[PDB]
Amino acid sequence: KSQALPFAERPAKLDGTLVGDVGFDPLGLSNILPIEWMREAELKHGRVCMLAVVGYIVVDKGLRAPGAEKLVAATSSFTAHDAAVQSGHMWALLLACGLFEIVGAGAIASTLNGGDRKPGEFALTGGFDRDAAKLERFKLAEIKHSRLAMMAFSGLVTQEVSQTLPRLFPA
Amino acid sequence: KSQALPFMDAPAPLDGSMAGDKGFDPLNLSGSFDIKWMREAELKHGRVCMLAWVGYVAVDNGFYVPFAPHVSSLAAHDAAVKAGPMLGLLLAVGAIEAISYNAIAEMMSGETDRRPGDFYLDPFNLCSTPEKLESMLEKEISHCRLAMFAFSGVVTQSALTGGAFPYT
Amino acid sequence: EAADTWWGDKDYPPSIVLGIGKDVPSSIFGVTSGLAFAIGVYCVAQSNLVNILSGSTVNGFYVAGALLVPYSWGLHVAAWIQKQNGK
Amino acid sequence: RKPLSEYVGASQELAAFPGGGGKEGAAPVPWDPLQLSELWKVSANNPDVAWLREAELKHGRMSMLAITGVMVQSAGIHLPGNADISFANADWAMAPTTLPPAAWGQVLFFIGLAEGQTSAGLFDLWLGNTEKREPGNLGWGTQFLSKDKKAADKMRLKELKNGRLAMLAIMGVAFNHVIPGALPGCMY
Ligand code: CLA
Ligand code: CLA
Ligand SMILES: CCCCCC(=O)OC\C(C=C=C1C(C)(C)C[C@H](OC(C)=O)C[C@@]1(C)O)=C/C=C/C(C)=C/C=C/C=C(C)/C=C/C=C(\C)C(=O)C[C@@]12O[C@]1(C)C[C@@H](O)CC2(C)C
Ligand SMILES: CC(=O)O[C@H]1CC(C)(C)C(=C=C/C(C)=C/C=C/C(C)=C/C=C/C=C(C)/C=C/C=C(\C)C(=O)C[C@@]23O[C@]2(C)C[C@@H](O)CC3(C)C)[C@](C)(O)C1
Ligand SMILES: CC1=C(C#C/C(C)=C/C=C/C(C)=C/C=C/C=C(C)/C=C/C=C(C)/C=C/[C@@]23O[C@]2(C)C[C@@H](O)CC3(C)C)C(C)(C)C[C@H](O)C1
Ligand SMILES: CC1=C(C#C/C(C)=C/C=C/C(C)=C/C=C/C=C(C)/C=C/C=C(C)/C=C/[C@@]23O[C@]2(C)C[C@@H](O)CC3(C)C)C(C)(C)C[C@H](O)C1
8 A cells, every 4th residue: 555665555644744755664663753753853864964964075075164273173074073072163063053952943843742833844944935836846855855865974974984984085 | 923933923822011022932931930930030130140241341441449459350259259248248149139039929929019020229210101111121131131141251251261351 | 728739539630739830841841850860860870980088079069960869750740740631 | 341251361282181272272261270360359459350461461571582682692692892892791690790881771771761651551450441551552563463353362372372481481591590400401
C-alpha cells in the first residue's frame, strides 16, 4: 500500500498531510512522539546539515572570516572545531544558538502540540508568500535537500576522518 | 497576534494591557506565574542596572567623595568592603527591602491596588494625566531594558580588559 | 481561612495544591525536574568523586546545587499533577 | 475480571501425558498449583492475574535479553574500544564494574526513563481494571502481529514459552556464579 515499499502495507499516521510523504516508515517510529515533533526535528536537522555542508565546503576550499587570524582552524575545517573551542568562539556560537533555540524552539514546539501553526514555519518568508503552489513546491524542495544534505554531510565527515583529511576538497 | 514573534498569538492573555508589551515571551513564563511579580522584578532590575551603570561610569572618571581611596570601579567593591561603608550601604538597602517585602506582599494578594514597581515617589507631578503616565512608563521600561545590557557590557569589558573609561 | 484541598473522591489532586506554581504547565515541570536532577546529582557527585575537605574543598556552589535533588522530586510529582489536570 | 482461562500461556508439555493436547496449550485450565491467581478473592492486597502477566512478561523479556547478552559477552564480540573506555571484561556480572560512570550510569538512566514512561496503567492493574494497558502491550510491535485470533495467540504463546525458558536459564547462569554448581553444563 506504501509508495517507497510497495509490498508491505502503509505506515499509520503517514496519510500525506506533510509534504514528501511516500510512506517510508518500516520501523513504525511515527508513534513514539507526535508527528509535528518529528517533522520539526527533520526540518531543523536538514537546515543545520545544509548550512553545515555549505560551511564545510567553503571553509575547506579556503576562505577566512573577518580577522580570522592564523591558527589550526585556518589549516582546515577538520581542526577548526578543536581550534575554536580553545579560543572560546564555540562558546559564543553556542550562546547565539542557545538564544535563538530558546526563543524559536520553545515557541515552535510548545504551540504545535497546543495547536496553532504548521510544523516549522518561523514566519521569516523573506519574499515568496503569495504563490502558495510555489510555497508547497519549496517545502518539497526544502525537505528533499534536507535529506540529501544530511546524507551529504555524513558522507563528507566520514570520508575525511577515514583518511584524516590529506587536504582533499573532493573528499 | 503577537508583535515581536509574528508566528504566534499572545503568550497567555496576561500580555494584553501593560506598558512595553510586544508579545515577547517564548518560554511561557507570563502565564505560568503571576505577571505582577515579573513586572516588579523587571522594573527593579532595570532601576538597579541604571544606577549601577551611572555609578560605575562616575567612579571610573574621578568623582570620588571625601576619603574613599581612589581606585578604579573594578576594585572599588573590594576596597570599600575592606574599608567598611559597604556594610552600612547593605544595611540601608536591607531596610528598604524590608519595606519592599511589605509592599510586594500587599500587592500580590488583594487588599492593595499597587502597580508592580509603583511606589509613590513622584514629587513633581510628571504623571498626573494618564497619557503622560503611560508615556513615562514606556520610557522607563525601555530604559530598563537598555541599561541592563549597558551595565552588563560595562562590567564584562572592564573585567576582561585592564580598564579604561570607554572600555575599548 | 483556606481552600478545599481534599481530593479523596478524585483520582488526582487539584491544581491548587501547587500553591504559587499552580499554573505552570506539565512540560516545564518535567524538563526542570530532569535538569534539576542532573545538576544535583552532578553537584553531589563532586563531593565523592573529589574528597570533600575541611575548608579547602567545600565549594558552596556544589552545596547549593545539592539541594536540587530533593527539589527534583517535587518537580516530577508536580509534573504528574498538572498532566492529569490537563494543564 | 478476566478469570485466567482466556489468558494465553497454557503449555502442551504440562499435558504431555495421554489425555490433553492441542497446538501448544493444555486444554483443561492453565498451570496454577498454588492458586496464586485466585488470591485476589481474599484481600485486595494480592495482585490480579493481569499484574502477574505483566510481571512475567517483563521478567521474560529482560531474561531473553540478559541470556543473549550472557551468551555473546562470554566469548568475544565486544564493541570497538576508544579512549577512556574499554569493553574488554568478557566475564559477565563484572562487566559493569570495569566501566566509566558515563556508560553504566546511562544504561540505568534510560532503562528508568523507559520504565517510568511506560508505567501508565500498571496500577489500573492489581485490581483487574484492564480497560487500557492490556498487560504487556507497550506498543512496540502492536499491529505487526497477525490480525486474526489463532495466529496472534500462537505468537503470544511462543513469546511466553521462550521467555520462561530464558528466565530459568538466566537464573541457571546466575546462582552458579554465586555458588559453584547449580548448572552441570555451565560454560560460564
Ligand atoms: C552548521 C553550521 C556551521 C557551523 C557549526 C560552523 C562552524 C564554524 N565555522 Mg562556519 N560557516 C557556515 C556554517 C557553519 N559554520 C556557513 C553556512 C558559512 C557560509 C559559507 C560559513 C562560513 C565560515 C567562514 C568564512 C569561516 C567559518 C568559521 C567557522 C569556525 C569558527 C566560527 C566562529 O568563530 O563562530 C563563533 C563566532 C560567532 C560570532 C558565532 C556566529 C554567529 C552567527 C550569526 C550564527 C548565529 C545563528 C545564525 C543567525 C543562524 C540562525 C538562523 C535562523 C535565524 C533561522 C567554526 C568551526 C571560521 C573558521 O575559523 O574557519 C577556519 C571562518 O573563517 N565559517
Ligand atoms: C516472575 C515470575 C513469574 C510470574 C509472575 C508468572 C505469572 C504467571 N504464570 Mg508463570 N512461569 C514462570 C514465571 C512466572 N510466571 C516461569 C519461570 C515458568 C517456567 C517454569 C513459568 C511457567 C508457567 C506455565 C507453564 C504457566 C504459567 C502461568 C502463569 C499465570 C498464572 C499462574 C500464577 O498465578 O502464577 C503466579 C506466579 C508468581 C506470583 C511468581 C512468584 C513465585 C513464588 C510465589 C515465589 C518464588 C518461588 C519460586 C519457586 C522461586 C524459587 C527459584 C526459582 C527461580 C525456580 C501467571 C500470569 C499459567 C498461564 O499461562 O496462565 C494463563 C501457566 O499455565 N507460568
Ligand atoms: C534534560 C533531562 C531529560 C531527561 C529527564 C526528564 O526530563 O524526564 C522527566 C521524567 C519523565 C518524563 C518526561 C515527561 C516530563 C513526562 C514528558 C517529557 O516531554 C515533555 C517536555 O512533555 C518527556 C520526558 C520523558 O522527559 C521523570 C522525572 C523523574 C524525576 C526527576 C525523578 C526524581 C527523583 C528524585 C528523587 C527520588 C530525590 C531523592 C532525594 C534524596 C534521597 C535526597 O534529597 C537526599 C539528600 O542528600 C540529598 C541528595 C541532598 C541533601 O541536601 C538533602 C538530603 C540529605 C535529604
Ligand atoms: C578566552 C576565551 O577563550 O573565550 C573568549 C571567546 C570570545 C568569543 C573571543 C569572547 C567574546 C566575546 C563575547 C562572548 C561577546 C558577547 C557579546 C554579547 C552577547 C553582547 C550583547 C549585547 C547586547 C546588546 C547589543 C543589546 C542590544 C539591545 C538593543 C539594541 C535594544 O534595542 C533593546 C530594546 O530594549 C530596547 C532598548 C527597547 C525595547 O522596547 C525594544 C528592545 C527590547 C529591542 C571572550 C569574552 O573573550 C571569551
Ligand atoms: C529562507 C530564507 C532564505 C534562505 C535560505 C537558505 C539558507 C537556503 C539554503 C539552502 C541550502 C544551503 C541548501 C543546501 C543544500 C546542500 C546540499 C544539497 C548538499 C549536497 C551535497 C551532496 C549531494 C554531496 C556532497 C559530497 O560530499 C559527498 C556526499 C561526498 C564527497 O566526496 C563529494 C561531495 C562533496 C560532492 C533567504 C531567501 C536567503 C533569505 C530569506 O529571508 C529567508
Ligand atoms: C546487568 C547485567 C545483566 C543482566 C541482567 C538482568 C536485568 C537480568 C534479569 C534477570 C531476571 C529478570 C530474571 C528473572 C527470573 C525470574 C524467574 C526465574 C521466575 C521464576 C518463577 C517461578 C519458577 C514460578 C513458578 C510458579 O509460579 C508458577 C509458575 C505457578 C505457581 O502456582 C507455582 C510456582 C510458584 C512454582 C546481564 C546481561 C545478565 C549480564 C551483564 O553483563 C550485566
